Amino acid sequence: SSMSYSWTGALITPCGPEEEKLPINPLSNSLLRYHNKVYCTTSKSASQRAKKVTFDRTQVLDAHYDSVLKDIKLAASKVSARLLTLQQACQLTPPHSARSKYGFGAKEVRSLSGRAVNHIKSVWKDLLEDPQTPIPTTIMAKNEVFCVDPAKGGKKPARLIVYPDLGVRVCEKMALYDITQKLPQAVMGASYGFQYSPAQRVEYLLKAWAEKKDPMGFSYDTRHFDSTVTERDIRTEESIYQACSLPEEARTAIHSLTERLYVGGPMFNSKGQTCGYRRCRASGVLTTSMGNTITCYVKALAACKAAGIVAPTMLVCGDDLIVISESQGTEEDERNLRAFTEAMTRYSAPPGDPPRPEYDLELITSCSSNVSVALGPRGRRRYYLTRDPTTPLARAAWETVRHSPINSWLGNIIQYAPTIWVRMVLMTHFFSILMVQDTLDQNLNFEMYGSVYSVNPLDLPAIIERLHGLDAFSMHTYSHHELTRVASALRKLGAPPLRVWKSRARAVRASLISRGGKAAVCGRYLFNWAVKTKLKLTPLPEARLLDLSSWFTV
Ligand SMILES: Cc1cc2nc3c(=O)[nH]c(=O)nc-3n(C[C@H](O)[C@H](O)[C@H](O)COP(=O)(O)OP(=O)(O)OC[C@H]3O[C@@H](n4cnc5c(N)ncnc54)[C@H](O)[C@@H]3O)c2cc1C
Ligand SMILES: Nc1ccn([C@@H]2O[C@H](COP(=O)(O)OP(=O)(O)O)[C@@H](O)[C@H]2O)c(=O)n1
Ligand SMILES: [Mn+2]
Ligand SMILES: [Mn+2]
Numbered sequence: 001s002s003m004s005y006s007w008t009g010a011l012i013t014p015c016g017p018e019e020e021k022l023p024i025n026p027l028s029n030s031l032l033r034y035h036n037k038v039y040c041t042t043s044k045s046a047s048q049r050a051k052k053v054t055f056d057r058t059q060v061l062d063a064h065y066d067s068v069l070k071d072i073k074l075a076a077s078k079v080s081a082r083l084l085t086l087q088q089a090c091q092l093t094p095p096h097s098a099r100s101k102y103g104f105g106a107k108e109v110r111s112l113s114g115r116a117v118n119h120i121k122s123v124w125k126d127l128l129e130d131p132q133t134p135i136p137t138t139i140m141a142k143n144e145v146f147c148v149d150p151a152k153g154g155k156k157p158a159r160l161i162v163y164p165d166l167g168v169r170v171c172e173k174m175a176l177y178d179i180t181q182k183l184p185q186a187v188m189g190a191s192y193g194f195q196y197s198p199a200q201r202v203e204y205l206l207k208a209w210a211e212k213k214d215p216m217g218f219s220y221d222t223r224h225f226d227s228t229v230t231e232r233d234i235r236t237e238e239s240i241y242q243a244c245s246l247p248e249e250a251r252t253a254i255h256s257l258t259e260r261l262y263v264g265g266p267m268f269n270s271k272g273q274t275c276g277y278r279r280c281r282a283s284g285v286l287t288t289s290m291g292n293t294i295t296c297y298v299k300a301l302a303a304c305k306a307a308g309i310v311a312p313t314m315l316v317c318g319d320d321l322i323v324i325s326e327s328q329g330t331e332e333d334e335r336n337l338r339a340f341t342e343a344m345t346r347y348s349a350p351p352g353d354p355p356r357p358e359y360d361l362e363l364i365t366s367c368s369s370n371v372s373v374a375l376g377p378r379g380r381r382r383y384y385l386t387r388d389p390t391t392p393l394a395r396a397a398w399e400t401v402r403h404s405p406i407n408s409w410l411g412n413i414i415q416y417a418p419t420i421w422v423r424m425v426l427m428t429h430f431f432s433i434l435m436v437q438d439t440l441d442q443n444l445n446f447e448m449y450g451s452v453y454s455v456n457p458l459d460l461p462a463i464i465e466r467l468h469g470l471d472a473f474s475m476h477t478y479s480h481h482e483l484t485r486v487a488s489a490l491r492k493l494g495a496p497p498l499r500v501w502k503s504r505a506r507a508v509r510a511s512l513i514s515r516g517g518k519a520a521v522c523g524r525y526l527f528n529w530a531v532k533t534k535l536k537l538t539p540l541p542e543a544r545l546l547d548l549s550s551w552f553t554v
Helices: 045-052 063-077 088-091 106-110 115-130 168-180 183-191 198-211 231-242 248-262 290-304 330-346 390-396 406-415 420-436 456-469 480-492 498-513 515-527 543-544
Strands: 004-008 038-040 139-141 146-149 160-163 215-221 266-270 276-279 310-317 320-328 370-375 382-385 446-448 451-455
Touching: 004 451, 004 456, 038 168, 045 139, 045 160, 045 198, 045 276, 063 088, 063 183, 063 231, 063 290, 088 106, 088 115, 088 498, 106 183, 106 543, 115 168, 139 276, 146 382, 146 390, 168 183, 168 215, 183 231, 183 290, 183 310, 198 215, 198 310, 198 320, 198 370, 198 456, 231 290, 266 451, 290 310, 290 330, 320 515, 370 480, 390 406, 390 420, 390 480, 406 446, 406 456, 420 456, 420 480, 420 498, 420 515, 451 456, 456 515, 480 498, 498 515
Parallel strands: 139 266
Antiparallel strands: 004 276, 038 146, 139 160, 215 320, 266 276, 310 320, 370 382, 446 451
């Protein structure tokens, strides 16, 4: 049937400046040496990604899909959702959100400036009066940092991002924000990812594994997921939304947004030249994350029925997917997974790498993370969530006139506190830098799922205990897999071995213990691993006061 994109041949031009690296990276050049391997994706590679995501889609559904969609619309029916006030949608736009063509930006929108509320009023009225005229969109290449992989063809091309004008984006939040806060949870229940903190997600998968008599799990990621969603997928999304109890005014704007924006439309480059036509998901609309996860859940759930997966348990984060199920014998389990893949290829959610049955929780990698195990001095098994540290290290090295890696470090220290690589590398380099800057007690921004939370470095012990528990300061023996990987990534980026980090840490700890106060608590908790006569860590009362609920949610 339809083509994901078509192109006029106009270039995908840069939105602002794409910065050169500098000849000295003074904050991260004592972290790793091979700064030549750290690169940022750029609009240069945008045509390359363009050719990789343009393809003819052929969707073929069936009674399994049809059965799922029916039950998911019924779950949807139990949701009641309201319009947001224009004023509320305004106050939800980020403080740096891309300006409007109509001469005003995030600052006026957040401050309810009259100019802005006026234009946005008339944009809302156009949505309610006009259900057909396509809404134009800007296409830009995403800039993100990676390490090179010669085994994966040098550098990844930039991801394609496609978003409507700032006026339209506020309007989306009025029509759809409340649903984005209620629908996913309701139709997916505990299967919704994006409601679990790292430890909660380990808890969940651990539980799923043990419920099964003979457990078996696999993970799935659709290849170029935004380009695989078809105009029918998007219209089916509208009907899942319309399944809820909504005011009539919202249904009207929801329908207009779907027909005029979500099912597709013309894309213009940043220079204003008309650039192509889009017939798939624009990664940029409000519903990007919700549509990804619900359309992924429905297809994946259908495919489970097609493949005869027994007693499935799912975890769905966008297009990343984990399924813990009852094993039917390894021979059947392989056949079933080909069936699952053939099904989802029929649903137009074809895979990146072919999925594969695994019978060991550490061998299932999804959401770029995996569960792993460490002992204590206890001998007791502590389970946690880790990842390949390559990309975290690469972004620990991204350092230009306009970006500081220091937020990147904090973010990983918070999210992966129990990992050997956070504990021995990032935590050490973090506090070492801040002390030399005399910055320990000056706040940083932690960033996750759009929200930005303020964090004081000297609070990391309490924060980490509230998130991961006191076991995060006691992991004695890490797994052969984890040791191998962290070792290899450190070699790959020219960072010191773990041996050397242990020495550095001993010194860091000594140095902030002897600042007393909150700084010393940091050294006794965060660096208990570096001294041979470990002190007995006690729970921290201030952790009992922290409420980190909304940190790892949506
Ligand atoms: C709803 C949502 C909104 C986000 N908004 C921002 C933002 O405004 N500014 C910012 O700097 N980072 C944003 N991010 C990125 C986010 O903060 C994490 O960095 C990201 O999820 C990578 O963490 P991960 O463990 O899930 O790794 P990953 O394996 O990279 O993510 C797993 C899945 O989450 C989804 N996803 C990944 N990145 C994004 C993304 N940028 N936007 C939407 N979905 C994504 C995808 O479906 C992906 O398959 C957002 C992520 C989500 C899920
Ligand atoms: N920076 C990002 C990353 C992913 N996503 C969404 O998540 C989907 C799948 O995530 P992904 O990491 O597997 O990237 P793809 O190569 O599948 O496009 C995208 O296709 C996007 O719709 C986004 O909106 N912004
Ligand atoms: Mn994908
Ligand atoms: Mn993915």
